[PDB]
Paper text:
The apo structure of nADSL shows an identical tertiary and quaternary structure to that of hADSL, consisting of an all α-helical homotetramer that differs between the two variants with a RMSD (root mean square deviation) between Cα atoms of 0.5 Å. A superposition of the separate domains 3 of nADSL and hADSL shows that the Ala429Val substitution has no effect on the local structure nor does it influence the local hydrogen bond networks. The SAXS curves from apo nADSL and hADSL are identical and fit well the theoretically calculated curves from the corresponding apo crystal structures (for q-values between 0.07 nm−1 and 4 nm−1). Hence, consistent with the results obtained by the structural comparison, nADSL and hADSL have an identical in-solution molecular structure in their apo state which is well described by their respective crystal structures.
ADSL is involved in the de novo purine biosynthesis and recycling pathways in which it catalyses the conversion of 5-aminoimidazole-(N-succinylocarboxamide) (SAICAR) to 5-aminoimidazole-4-carboxamide ribotide (AICAR) and the conversion of succinyladenosine monophosphate (SAMP) to adenosine monophosphate (AMP), respectively. Domain 1 (residues 22–112) and domain 2 form the base and one side of the active site thus creating a binding cleft for the substrate, while domain 3 (residues 365–450) resembles a lid which sits on top of the active site.
Author numbering:
A (entry chain D): 8 to 288, 293 to 475
B (entry chain C): 9 to 281, 296 to 473
C (entry chain B): 8 to 284, 292 to 479
D (entry chain A): 9 to 387, 409 to 481
């Protein structure tokens, strides 16, 4: 692309070449020809006057596409499909008269879109499986590392770095399920005619309903779909595009949340994005990859409104106000998702943790959450609950004033150590303030989660 | 009071049953229910709770002093502790063990899940019922030809019932979505302030097994098959995305269906049980259902760590509104579907005006079959078509293409064929067989469990 | 009402009584009657058979509204306007025959919607002005107080607490200007008939176009509007609802940003929400609520965008139920947000020693160029000094991250005799006020030039809490 | 290359001029322009910058080595520093003073503002031309009666021109909104990395007036009347909301207009203009699809969808800036303007020679009018129509009944369609003179430019 024209940053800058190719005109028109080859093979099988020589010349010329010629013919014809029937028949002169036999434009246009959507999903699925797997390794590594919990982004009951990572993983697992469900349930349009009635194919087969049904089943199987619609207008219902982009929107919400947490952890200096390759010969580090993931994820959420609106105002058996919008949103949704998953994998590969910063923060906040434990110990040693409460309240106030009014380190535990009133529990104080004892069931939750929910989910993706 | 704003969703639009599901009575009775279950399970697991305490709670689930709870909430600045205190007031014997070990979201967030599920349960039979009425209609009208439209321009004929199947199929997809979401909803259970169950762990003196039993048992008592293992304070707000996304997609389906119905009313081919007001209302509400999807998308995207409370007010609005809106739509769509009136004579007249321009191909094939040239016959049709089209558009007159073809001696080999060549049923392709196969394979089996 | 049914929390928990009333049935049907009165007044002036007695009796019974009779008459008739014509005629027996004369439903329905939108904008405006004024006071108070700057939420060139407050204030001033513009530019529908062509009134005035135009002008002026549409279909263009809810959505975005910043400052213990009628751990719950509701305001913009987009011809009635929801909810949501944000703004809590400690931890890493320059001025080498400061800074950075320790960079500089030509200077070189650039002067000029002048019209309502 | 994806906005849809405004060439020449302006102002303010340094920069604003700059961005990990280095290579005399005292968003963010303003400037005349073509049409059809539609059911007659005025008025509102947003855009200027101008205050050795002078000077050289006083790192992202919200609302207007045209096309009352290849063709198709209208709807829909991107972005900016705005804005701001530009090009084409069939219009009026004239006559046919799809026979029944003898001779006059259109034709004329013409007058000199 020239620097003198706009180039989508989703092609040029962001997405992988594999996803870029799925949405390319090369892939599109090659798949159009592929569909025409399948149609010819099935029509031959069903008794139509098509030869093995005609089939073989189509098969040899699936990739040999004259784009200049197609574009020229599209000018005079003003019909993209017929422009390509012409260009295909030019390089396939024996087969020319039977290309597109009995079909309408959407046999190629709309089935190709479904193949594209399915192949795009099949590119995302393994990438999403891989990021989940890398985060699972991290979660298990850090399963028992105590970290300050945050509710309202204020100190709260301690969690572990790995348990927090499980919140992230779980949302991504829900995405993996949704994506796989939408992919697997996607139906083929098949051979349906202009308004879905198969009137053209019925006539071609001389009123033979069984042959129309069989043809529909054969192209569906050749394209590798399990199932075709029975009911369509001109195209697959545009409710499908809502299903697909809704699950991508939800994925975007998940990633926006995870990468927001990561950016906040980076401010706290508890976690940072992976160190990047050394240049031959820094204190401050910006979580730029997580920022980019948020930025893009937002756009994936935004896009959901396109297919919602499109579907809601489709009139009868189709209106073509779906077409320009789909050319933008379907491709953009997938290229944005791809980019996000490529970046998130890169974030996952060697996340940096600073346990001494984490520890320090716990030591600042934990004492204000440990006071019932200190009361219980005093009471167990023969002390008075009332007096211990009154005394803890006063020392706690003193420490809180050091922290806020003076900008000091929390000295509550040191106040308690120095006060002879707490003499009966001074020897227990390290044990009573052990952060691992305040993480509840965090580490066991990680283990049960990974074994019962995450590994089983990943198992079938081990091939790809 | 007419002196204050009153939700049009509550007063005007939605059913009393769905309004009740989102009422404070339902909410606070469910808080008490969850406190009962917690005590029952805690007793089984060895905690000092008596049968008398449990029976007292059980006799007072509905006995709620909303005035006291609202006054205590002003004092304590804490809705849950306000309801603990109020419940303890009418249950003095149980008062010390209500909420034992629990945190606020044990009642708040589990109650939301209960509500979401019961609201889906109310929608499910309504949607099946609509699909069923429309299916009866599609079957009745499976063979009735009607003009096809692409670009809202005359196209290959369909049937009234085949078109109806486009509508039915989107609604079947909605039905399956709502059911999946309903069945897959998991319980929060007992999870603590940050999801670690630390408060329960301490209540059980470090016994993990007891914590896991408690979680299993309250989940069972609430009638859920599964609880989360992993939470922060609350169930992941991704769940609310999943729920409102299926409602939004439902709204898109309804808007499309009710748009087609409004267009059919302009064409005088079909009417609702004279303006298509029910269909307009459906569209108007369906649009709001689509808009609402952005609320939970945004919310989940900016939850920090184990929860921020910027979810709360938003969810009070969007969750209830989405369900109350969806309910109204289904009640209205039910009324539309019970009384669709078709005017076959209007349909027939429109077909007779448009069909000739679409029959030019079959006229050419018949001339060929009695000897003629393809290219001669195309050019003869082209001139007569051009003339008929001028009469239609330039003169505002009825289409005379068939009369033109009869009056031209060239078409003598065909003249006696013309009535049959332009029989509308012969242009509907496989429409009626598609209806029957769709109803038997796809719709009936879906509906059978609901009947 | 009853706890046995849904009650919108916008009406029952969140919005002010005044905003709730603007969207009430009482207000709506009083305004219908008002519009009937004005119609009758203008109709008499242009010579229609309407007497002072008939007029005086409508004026007497503007508020005397029997809702039960209106509701039963609507159940019988299934037309809200005719039900209200009949109910108004019942208590105005002498005027009954002239009420609604020559008008169509939207004369009352749609003109009332405009009067509501305008009144609702008028309630928001002074609330937004008060928030701006409280925050201006804060920005002035805190103009010179250094604080750590944040880009990517990482340490950056110091700002001041007041300068950062001006980021918030500016966006709110842009919202105030938008709300006012929209309020001012709102046009009346006036008298337009069923399809915008004024046929009913043309015929009522026996073909006199001048009298139809005068009626339109006169009802418009009686309703307090400067200007009526020339062109309508049945109703005002629904593009208007986009204009109004877009400005509210943008206000939501500003508030969401501001309150997200406050939430982050509260985590950092630098700023907290005002003390309520001293606990160590405090949650920024008002700010969280403002974010929550601001989000809904943003969401709602998609309602009028979609509605306008699919209006067929001179009106389709698929706008009606949606507008009953989104127009009221957006204003009630905005009202709540403004009431809450004004509360947040009254007595914000700042912890300067927390702010100072954080600066002391981060500033040395940003001071290393000021130090190099002071070495270069006393003789030394830019490149020499750069390599020595890099090694010590790396050591200090490792104390911070690998050990969880306080930053010791200035201590390591103090203890290294290579820096002896600048040891006397270090206190001055590390003065935080010298790192805030022009923050304090920016505050002063902004408040003088851009904020105080916007507030000037609202001075008489400024002091309410 | 057809072997990767390419935005259909760049290749297929938008005009080359809008495409260029969002191009890398435009971007990076604008960086260099801003660096030149900076140097010129800094020279005036006394910094050691020579006329030769300035002239060397001025001679190389367009001489951009994209390949080298990309490679340098990879080495330095910094887009601005890559461009500083690459510009210093072609301007070795100036190399030492390029970007002097500035920070990254001096070029990045000011360039975005120049782009936004340029883009708006391209849209305005296009919209003005649409409005003018429709105003021509409205005027010529001001009196042509046509069936009014409420609920898309027969309602009080309007006129083809009056109906077109509904479309025009929405677009006039868009044109005023676009103009306001363009006029109100402020320059970021020189603000530093957190908005405090610290780097410039240091460059000028603590002289505040010099910093203020530099901000004023770069703002003036860039053609902006006003700079922000207050920024963080960048201009407030509220500005992006303001700009995309006006485009969204334009999208809504265009969707409604093009939905009406599609419905009229179904009714055969109005069609999209004959394409060049069809004009006078003896091969004119009977069935014409309103494809340009469909396209405009489809695109206008995306415009409306995009409004959620800047809403969300602004809402979650933390403090003096977070860089989660960057990728999103790269997408949405360019897409919104390419989509709008496409819509306006197409809509201008639609507006130039709309096809009207008065005899179709007339026949539909005769079907519905007898039912709307009963009031005037007092001074079954419905069941036939509904059950038989027959022609309306109400008038024919009336002339053949004894009872209506007093009225019979008026029945032609009483059914005159012109008498049912109310004030539609006068409304058109007052609207055009008072509200439309005055808005178009600034655009007189570019009215004649053709559809693309
Ligand atoms: Cl894997
Ligand atoms: Cl077909
Ligand atoms: Cl096909
Ligand atoms: Cl806990
Ligand atoms: Cl709990
Ligand atoms: Cl009228
Ligand atoms: Cl009126
Ligand atoms: Cl700076
Ligand atoms: Cl700068």
């Amino acid at each position: 692309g020239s620097p003198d024209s706009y180039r989508s940053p989703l092609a040029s800058r962001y997405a992988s070449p594999e996803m870029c190719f799925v949405f390319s005109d090369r892939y599109k028109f090659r798949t159009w020809r592929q569909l025409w080859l399948w149609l010819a093979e099935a029509e031959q099988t069903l008794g139509l006057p098509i030869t093995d020589e005609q089939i073989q010349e189509m098969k040899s010329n699936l990739e040999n596409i004259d784009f200049k010629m197609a574009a020229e013919e599209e000018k005079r014809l003003r019909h993209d499909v017929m422009a390509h029937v012409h260009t295909f028949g030019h390089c396939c002169p024996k087969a020319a008269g039977i290309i597109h036999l009995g079909a309408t434009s959407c046999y190629v246009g709309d089935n190709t879109d479904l193949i594209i959507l399915r192949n795009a999903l099949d590119l995302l699925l393994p990438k999403l499986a891989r990021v989940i797997s890398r985060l699972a390794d991290f979660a298990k590594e850090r399963a028992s590392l105590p970290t300050l919990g945050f509710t309202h982004f204020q100190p709260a009951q301690l969690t572990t770095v790995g348990k927090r990572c499980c919140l992230w993983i779980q949302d991504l697992c829900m995405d993996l399920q949704n994506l796989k469900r939408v992919r697997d349930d996607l139906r083929f349009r098949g051979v349906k005619g202009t308004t879905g009635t198969q009137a053209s194919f019925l006539q071609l087969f001389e009123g033979d309903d069984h042959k129309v049904e069989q043809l529909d089943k054969m192209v569906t199987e050749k394209a590798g779909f399990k199932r075709a619609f029975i009911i369509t207008g001109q195209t697959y219902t545009r409710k499908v595009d809502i299903e697909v982009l809704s699950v991508l929107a939800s994925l975007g919400a998940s990633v926006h949340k995870i990468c927001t947490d990561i950016r906040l952890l980076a401010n706290l200096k508890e976690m940072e994005e992976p160190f990047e390759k050394q240049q031959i010969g820094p204190y401050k580090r910006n979580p730029m990859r997580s920022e980019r993931c948020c930025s893009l994820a937002r756009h994936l959420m935004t896009l959901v409104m396109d297919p919602l609106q499109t579907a809601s105002v489709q009139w009868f058996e189709r209106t073509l106000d779906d077409s320009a919008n789909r050319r933008i949103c379907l491709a953009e949704a997938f290229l944005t998702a791809d980019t996000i998953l490529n970046t998130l994998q890169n974030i996952s590969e060697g996340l940096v943790v600073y346990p001494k910063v984490i520890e320090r923060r716990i030591r600042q906040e934990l004492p204000f959450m440990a006071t019932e434990n200190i009361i219980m110990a005093m009471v167990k040693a023969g002390g008075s609950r009332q007096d211990c409460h009154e005394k803890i309240r006063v020392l706690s106030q003193q420490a809180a004033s050091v922290v806020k009014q003076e900008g000091g380190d929390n000295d509550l535990i040191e106040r308690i150590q120095a006060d002879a009133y707490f003499s009966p529990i001074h020897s227990q104080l390290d044990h009573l303030l052990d952060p691992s004892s305040f993480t509840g069931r965090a580490s066991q939750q990680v283990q049960r989660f990974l074994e019962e929910e995450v590994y089983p989910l990943l198992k079938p993706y081990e091939s790809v």
